[PDB]
Amino acid sequence: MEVNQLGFIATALFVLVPSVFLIILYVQTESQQKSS
């Protein structure tokens, strides 16, 4: 159809920026005990 060439870019980001935020603070946590 006739979608907003960037609607996808916004969804993709908005699902990484916020999401990654957690795959960041989480990981640093398990390493609170010299682990991956």
């Binding site: 979608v3 908005f14 699902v15 916020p18 957690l22 603070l25 989480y26 946590t29």
Partner: protein, 37 residues
Amino acid sequence: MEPNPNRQPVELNRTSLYLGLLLILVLALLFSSYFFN
């Protein structure tokens, strides 16, 4: 320049992220079509 005490450790649990992840990814499903218009 002596180190800082007001620097507690940053808090986040292996399941809190999951509760967050769910809320975040799905939030997107909904709110995503409304982007593609």
